[PDB]
Amino acid sequence: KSIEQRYLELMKKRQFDTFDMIVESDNNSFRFVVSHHFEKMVRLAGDRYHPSRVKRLAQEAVTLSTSLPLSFSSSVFVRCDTDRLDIMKVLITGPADTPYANGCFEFDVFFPPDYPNQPMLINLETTGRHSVRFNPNLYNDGKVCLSVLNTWHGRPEEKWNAQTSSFLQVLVSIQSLILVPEPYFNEPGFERSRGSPSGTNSSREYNSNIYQACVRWAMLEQIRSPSQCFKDVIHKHFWLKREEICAQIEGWIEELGKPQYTERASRTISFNSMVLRRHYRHLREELSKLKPPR
């Protein structure tokens, strides 16, 4: 079988599953054994829930057990608490031909008690301890900016709709509109500057920054210290695609080595290329240590 066929056959079984995120503690309390961003909100909510939330979450789980996107380019993996559907973690691999390609990005999802009336809360965890802004819509504090997650006035076809909107729609929206090939033009106003040499240089600078950011945090830290929920998935994904990842990073380094027209962008590109080589050496060191999965 081709490597793509093996990847598709192996990652299909682990798309949706449950993990022990919460365990019993003393004096009728519970503690988190995994790092969840919305633990404080979970504790504040307590046992409050709207009656429709149970049915909505059951339907969402039924949809997610079979309809999660999966391809050799990008895939989505969802883990939920074994006893609570409203606490979830999402792993999205970067699509091909983008600065995020083959990078594992982890999100924390909490469904509020008012769901599906209020939109769910999603926060990006792969931020490099808030030192990296991966996208104009992905602030370094973890907040995700999407129109579908807004109940504010907006426009009826763009707001969060209690009938039409769903978790799968939000995941696909992130996967296809945030991890775009040219994230620089995601900012409004900058979109119409594309096609000009200055816009091209700015996009190249942004992509050069994102290259090293992704290589360090989305790949190296995920291999070194994977999340307990996605350990097996991350190991399999990085073992099956080590050669492709190495070739892609070498291509990135070669692209960054091309001459630049402006010195201001040239200095930043050279610095980012140096950092990218420094991180790629470590990544090559780590990839060789990956024992093959059974």
């Binding site: 006035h153 009826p156 709709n161 209690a162 009938q163």
Partner: protein, 76 residues
């Protein structure tokens, strides 16, 4: 036919409907003109609350009839 919808805050809305439209259609026209989703709208007429799946003929809503768009409040 033309009907009027009064909001609990006193704003008046004019709709162009037909005696056979359904309540879903009326709510959709209201959604165009105001912006509330149809499931958040409470229409009162002649002591009756309009429910989805019925037409204006059952409620005997005729020309120049006035509907009331009410809502619930969370104070106390």
């Amino acid at each position: 036919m033309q009907i009027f919808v009064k909001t609990l805050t006193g704003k008046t809305i004019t709709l162009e409907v037909e005696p056979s439209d359904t309540i879903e259609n009326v709510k959709a026209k209201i959604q165009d003109k105001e912006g509330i989703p149809p499931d958040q709208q409470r229409l009162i007429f002649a002591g009756k609350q309009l429910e989805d799946g019925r037409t204006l003929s059952d409620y005997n809503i005729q020309k120049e009839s006035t509907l009331h768009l009410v809502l619930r409040l969370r104070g106390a």
